[PDB]
Amino acid sequence: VGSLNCIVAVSQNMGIGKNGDLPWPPLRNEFRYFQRMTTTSSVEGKQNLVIMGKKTWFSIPEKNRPLKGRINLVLSRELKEPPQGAHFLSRSLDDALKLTEQPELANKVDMVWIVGGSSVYKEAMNHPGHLKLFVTRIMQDFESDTFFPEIDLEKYKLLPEYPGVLSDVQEEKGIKYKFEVYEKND
Ligand SMILES: *O=P(*)([O])(O[C][C]1O[C](N2[C]=NC3=C2N=[C]N=C3[N])[C](O(*)P(*)([O])([O])=O)[C]1[O])OP(*)([O])(=O)O[C][C]1O[C](N2[C]=[C][C]C(C([N])=O)=[C]2)[C]([O])[C]1[O]
Ligand SMILES: Cc1c(Sc2ccc(C(F)(F)F)cc2)sc2nc(N)nc(N)c12
Secondary structure, eight states, X not given: OOOEEEEEEEXXXXXXXXXXXXXSOOOHHHHHHHHHHHHOOSSTTOEEEEEEEHHHXXXXXXXXXXXXXXXXXXXXXXXXXXXXXXXXXXXSHHHHHHHHTSHHXXXXXXXXXXXXXXXXXXXXXXXXXXXXXXXXXXXSOOOOSEEOOOOOTTTOEEOSOOXXXXXXXXXXXXXXXXXXXXXXXX
């Protein structure tokens, strides 16, 4: 098993969701970036694993479920099996990561990507160890009901560059946004 990573897109007021969707109109290239980053596995013959909360799962439209070419693991304490389309179910982030060091997965999983929501992100970000955050900054306020947790810049350093990640400001349906990569190791 290779890297542990979080990926999020966040508005300026730290908003990531609203009424079970994203706070902003769909940005096609942000979705394409998310796809590319989560799917791409630099260790031939392995797949990436995506870990998400239950609400995040159901927030993805049904025909795009499971996220293709990735092992999909949903986090729930209420569900008794993976939702229709989902591969794995865990009752905690620990168990999910614990589940990756088993026979079934340990030689199949490369990168693990936490793809939301808030409480998964929160727990990951505050877990000791080597962790990157791939943060798309949507450069406006958008009204939101769910938020990205605080990034502690004493521990997380913004990288000045990263391969395969555009540094330049992007714009789509009149909304400016930028890609960032943060790294901690503690
Ligand atoms: O965390 P989300 O996905 O779901 C909450 C639901 O998840 C289960 N949960 C969460 N965390 C754990 C867990 N279960 C076990 N262990 C852990 N650690 C739990 O389900 P149950 O009760 O059945 O056990 C929780 O209730 O939901 P959220 O934070 O409410 O977010 C969804 C919103 O944000 C948007 N979004 C999601 C991901 C990324 C981004 C982004 N912009 O990058 C946005 C969604 O659209 C939605 O609005
Ligand atoms: C969960 C998420 C979304 S929600 C979502 C994800 C995928 C799909 C589709 F590819 F299936 F369409 C739809 C909604 S956009 C996005 N962008 C970044 N940078 N990071 C993320 N974690 C997400």
